[PDB]
């Protein structure tokens, strides 16, 4: 904590800055001593990361970054932590000059120098990590269509059970599957298991109806199973036709009863 | 590029150093002017991250970290880049003082100052990201045992098809499934589809044989399907008994033919 051990020399200082400039990282220095704790230290890389000019950023708080996606709970945690003068690390959504939305990790830690406080903001981009997750998702997608098991039960009997919570993102795969069903028109009976699926959405019912109509024209009976009794009662009120389509408490039970003669 | 704009003051310098110390990040400064470009600038956090003392690091090249897991190709790329005085980013496995292996991302970028060259080494830990992938893998594991579908074909007939490339890690789930199969001893016929699997390993054939023996005692016929004709010819040479087990070209074909009276 001296000019001896610290090691002055302005040449050393220039080196440290260039290194920071080479890699885009958001580190800034604020001064509580000045009004509203304004930001004094800013690197060039900051501008490229936020897309904001250095002149605008200096003299103003990173408040302008906050927008609709900004999580008030995180904001509140930060406010608490400064009052507690204790370090805090949180992730908070932020907006650029062009409105681009990106995630920005913020780490704040108090300093005690010359009996004076200090604040530092560190911003670490989560984008590289997001790209990694996206790569994984793409792999899952190719994998998901492939898993899409096919296994005819018998001759003219086919089944396509669904397991998991059907999200809107996942729904695209299903609509595409409609084209495949036309190819499988040969199978007279199709059995769909909804038992895997925890719950069934109302929008889903509309999909079931469209399929039965297309299937009826093509001459393919549709069977629905894994329907909860409570759900069926609700369905009856909506339309007497719902009861028209054979319903089995479970897949094993439908399969066992199916054959009889 | 001057003491004016740079902004001297040793107090500012101590501020920058503590902030680096608070968060463990491997940044070091080397001097090509001296012999063998020795490292002069090192932070305390470096020691905790590498588990090496500052006195031993300073004066020596990061070459000691390299070990068995070190990738020569990555080393050669670095050597090429320095000669080409162009920045290079690579990921290279390293070793600690206790022999703990970890991944170390290295970024090198040349600097031109006062008509002198300078080299900087940046190390970023991929441990956090590793933990994240591990969390994902745990989910997949719970999900994988759960996905393990169960769908009896009929009364007495059950099938458990395999899809995907059977790794050694994956093999643990299968051995565990052996216990479940005992519970399923009720089903007289068990059909296993190897068609989904791209290839079959010779070690696998040992597993099939053990299963048929246990199954035969319990009184449970075992049917293998999806076996490639080329593979069957190879199997015939190893043991006639291989033919002994019924083999179908496909699952659909075996299912259709199955019933006949
Ligand atoms: C050092 C420091 C850096 C900050 N950096 C960011 C930031 O990059 N992004 C963000 O959303 N909030 C950041 N904040 C929070 C805001 O700058 C500000 O402290 C908060 O919005 C409360 O200020 P206000 O009263 O003007 O809203 C930072 C806070 C401090 C103290
Ligand atoms: C600035 C700088 C930092 C380096 N840091 C590391 C490091 O942390 N880990 C690593 O495996 N290699 C690192 N290297 C590579 C070695 O330090 C060294 O350059 C390389 O092994 C060739 O040196 P040698 O001829 O002694 O093998 C670094 C190289 C430079 C130039």
UniProtKB/Swiss-Prot annotation, chains A, B:
Post-translational changes noted in the entry: FMN binds covalently to cysteine after exposure to blue light and this bond is spontaneously broken in the dark.
UniProt keywords, alphabetically: Chromophore, Flavoprotein, FMN, Photoreceptor protein, Receptor, Sensory transduction, Transcription, Transcription regulation
Gene3D superfamilies named among the record's database cross-references: PAS domain (3.30.450.20), STAS domain (3.30.750.24)
Pfam families: PAS_9, STAS
GO molecular function, one term: photoreceptor activity
Domain STAS intervals: 147-258
SMART domains the record matches: PAC, PAS
Domain PAC: 88-138
Modification type S-4a-FMN cysteine: residues: 62
Assembly with partners or alone: Homodimer.
Function: Exhibits the same spectroscopical features and blue-light induced photochemistry as plants phototropins, with the reversible formation of a blue-shifted photoproduct, assigned to an FMN-cysteine thiol adduct. Although it is a positive regulator in the activation of the environmental signaling branch of the general stress transcription factor sigma-B, its precise role is undetermined.
PANTHER family to which the protein is assigned, alphabetical: BLUE-LIGHT PHOTORECEPTOR, RSBT ANTAGONIST PROTEIN RSBS-RELATED
Protein name, entry field: Blue-light photoreceptor
Biological source species: Bacillus subtilis (strain 168)
């Amino acid at each position: 904590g001296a000019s001896f051990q610290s090691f002055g020399i302005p040449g050393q200082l220039e080196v440290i800055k260039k290194a920071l400039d080479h890699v885009r990282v958001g580190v800034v220095i604020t001064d509580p001593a000045l009004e509203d704790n304004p930001i004094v230290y800013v690197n060039q890389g900051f501008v490229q990361m936020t897309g904001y000019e250095t002149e605008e950023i200096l003299g103003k708080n990173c408040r302008f970054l906050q927008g609709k996606h900004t999580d008030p709970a995180e904001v509140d945690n930060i406010r608490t932590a400064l009052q507690n003068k204790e370090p805090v690390t949180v992730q908070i959504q932020n907006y650029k000059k062009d409105g681009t939305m990106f995630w920005n990790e913020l780490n704040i830690d108090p300093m005690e120098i010359e009996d004076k406080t200090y604040f530092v903001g560190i911003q670490n981009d989560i984008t590289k990590q997001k790209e990694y997750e996206k790569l994984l998702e793409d792999s899952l997608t190719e994998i998901t269509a492939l898993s899409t098991p096919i296994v005819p039960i018998r001759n003219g009997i086919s089944a396509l059970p669904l397991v998991g919570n059907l999200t809107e993102e996942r729904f695209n795969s299903i609509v595409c599957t409609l084209t495949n069903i036309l190819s499988t028109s040969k199978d007279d009976y199709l059995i769909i298991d909804l038992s895997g699926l925890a719950q069934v959405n109302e929008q889903t019912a509309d999909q079931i109806f469209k399929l039965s109509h297309l299937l009826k024209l093509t001459g393919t009976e549709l069977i629905i199973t894994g329907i909860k009794p409570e759900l069926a009662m609700k369905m009856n009120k909506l339309d007497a036709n719902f009861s028209s389509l054979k319903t089995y408490s479970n897949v094993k039970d439908a399969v066992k009863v199916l054959p009889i003669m």
